[PDB]
């Protein structure tokens, strides 16, 4: 008797829920999100089924903050994706939509281009991932108005002013880009090349406790919402634009 505990919600997890549902496999979805994708949320299930023989508990991208039981199998990324692993466990053959979900999860748009995604499949997967991540229609429409009316190109840098709360509707519509700076009155995020030079600027204005970053070709660096004043953000924006001279 297999039991799945699900973690952070994205297109993959939403595609996993659908496969589990169509294979009649029991799962508990606590509508979790990356900020709280912890094995601790499921202690009630861990204490009912854990170490009991007949049950195998699969954890799907669950952070193991408490000690897992003996009948726990971890499903995460390191190499197959959680969707592929779950699909091998269930011997479910992935359809085209599902192979594109897996590719998008592993490698964003380049991963879909490598499997031969048409332009309208990429848009559809991108749109469906943004919905599954909680982007509301308003941010989509604010991204279109920001791109159309508040986007200003300087050197290789895209600079976008917006009142949106989520920025993926902007990123996905401006891709491919080399440098992208998105700012609101309350936060800014920088995407693309040169994150370390942007790092010097941000530290001149805030502790590193309020800065978040990720490396690589899809690298980014930004400030946590409302941790900088609007005046400080406006000043930081100018200094980033002076890096293009």
| Positions that interact with Mn ion (CB under 5 A) | 12, 82, 105
- CB of 107 vs Mn ion, minimal distance in Å: 11
- CB of 185 vs Mn ion, minimal distance in Å: 33
CB of 105 or CB of 128, closer to Mn ion: 105
- Residue 73's CB is within 10 A of a number of other CB atoms, namely 14
Euclidean distance between CA atoms 189 and 223, whole angstroms: 6
Residue nearest to Mn ion (CB): 105
Euclidean distance between CA atoms 94 and 100, whole angstroms: 10
CB of 90 or CB of 243, closer to Mn ion: 90
Contact assessment for residue 44 and residue 5, using Cβ atoms and an 8 Å cutoff: no
- CB of 78 vs Mn ion, minimal distance in Å: 11
- CB of 77 vs Mn ion, minimal distance in Å: 5
- CB of 61 vs Mn ion, minimal distance in Å: 6
DSSP 169-205: HHHHHH-S-SEEEEE-SS-EEEEES-HHHHHHHHHTT
- β-strand partners of 192: 179
CB of 62 or CB of 170, closer to Mn ion: 62
Contact assessment for residue 122 and residue 175, using Cβ atoms and an 8 Å cutoff: no
CB of 105 or CB of 172, closer to Mn ion: 105
CB of 6 or CB of 233, closer to Mn ion: 6
CA dihedral 86, 37, 44, 90 (to 10 degrees): 0
């Amino acid at each position: 008797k297999h039991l799945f505990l699900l973690g952070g919600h994205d297109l993959e997890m939403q595609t996993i829920v659908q496969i589990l549902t169509d294979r009649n496999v029991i799962f508990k979805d606590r509508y979790l999100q990356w900020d709280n994708a912890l094995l601790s949320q499921y202690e009630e299930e861990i204490q009912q089924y854990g170490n009991k023989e007949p049950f195998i508990i699969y954890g799907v991208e669950l952070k193991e903050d408490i000690t897992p039981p003996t009948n726990y199998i971890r499903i995460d990324h390191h190499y197959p994706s959680a969707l592929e692993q779950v699909a091998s466990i269930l011997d479910h053959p992935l359809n085209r939509y599902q192979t594109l979900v897996a590719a998008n999860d592993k490698a964003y748009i380049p991963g879909m281009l490598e499997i031969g995604a048409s332009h309208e499949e990429i848009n559809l997967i991108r749109q469906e991932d943004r919905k599954a991540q909680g982007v509301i229609e308003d941010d989509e429409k604010l991204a279109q108005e920001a791109i159309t009316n508040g986007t200003e190109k300087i050197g290789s840098l895209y600079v976008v002013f917006t009142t949106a709360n989520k920025f993926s509707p902007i990123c996905d519509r401006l891709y491919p880009y080399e440098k992208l700076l998105i700012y609101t009155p309350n936060e800014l995020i920088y995407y693309g090349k040169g994150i370390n030079s942007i790092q010097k600027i941000l530290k001149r204005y805030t502790p590193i406790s309020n800065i978040f970053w990720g490396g690589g070709i899809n690298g980014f660096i930004g400030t946590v919402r409302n941790r900088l004043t609007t005046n400080e953000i406006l000043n930081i924006v100018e200094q980033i634009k002076l890096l293009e001279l």
